[PDB]
């Protein structure tokens, strides 16, 4: 979470896990709501996925906050800061004069 770009990649990598958890839970719920001994296995496997989805979502929001912070920190660097490091001012001053 050093810069805008890395924070963005990390947010995406968390989104992926959240998505796969959601898809598994939707599949299990569609199986359970389908028109025994299968529904018991479904309702048994459910809570493990439940207390994984919450972790994924919490982490996702944390990264979203962090990347908003990083972007806003990046946007304050003005042009003079980036331009203070130029090597030879002499040629530049000659040019402008």
């Amino acid at each position: 979470g050093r810069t805008y770009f890395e924070s963005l990649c990390e947010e995406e990598q968390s989104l992926q896990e959240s998505q796969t958890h959601l898809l598994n839970i939707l599949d299990i719920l569609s199986v359970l709501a389908d028109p025994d001994d299968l529904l018991t296995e479904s309702l048994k496997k459910l809570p493990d996925l439940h207390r994984e989805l919450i972790n994924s979502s919490i982490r996702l929001r944390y990264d979203k906050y962090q990347t908003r912070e990083a972007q806003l920190l990046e946007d304050t660097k003005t042009g003079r800061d980036v331009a203070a490091g130029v090597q030879n001012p002499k040629s530049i001053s000659e040019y402008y004069s």
């Binding site: 569609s30 709501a33 459910l46 989805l53 979502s57």
Partner: protein
Amino acid sequence: PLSQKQIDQVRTKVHYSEVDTPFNKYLDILGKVTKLTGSIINGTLSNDDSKIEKLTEQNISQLKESAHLRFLDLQSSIDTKKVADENWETCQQETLA
């Protein structure tokens, strides 16, 4: 009569407002599915009496389609913005050179 601390507080609130619709949509679907999951885990979930879900197996495919669409949308969104940032960085380096 408003003091200084209150003014600084409202200033920091305005300086951080963001409106990102795909993200809010994805998180909305996350909430709308985890509420139903937790309700079914409770066992007295509903018969669509309250406004938390509908167990009807005729809208489950709607939930899956919406999940896929919103996930893809948010994915494309963060992809676009990171590409735009890389492009701005490249152009700044070019003009500095």
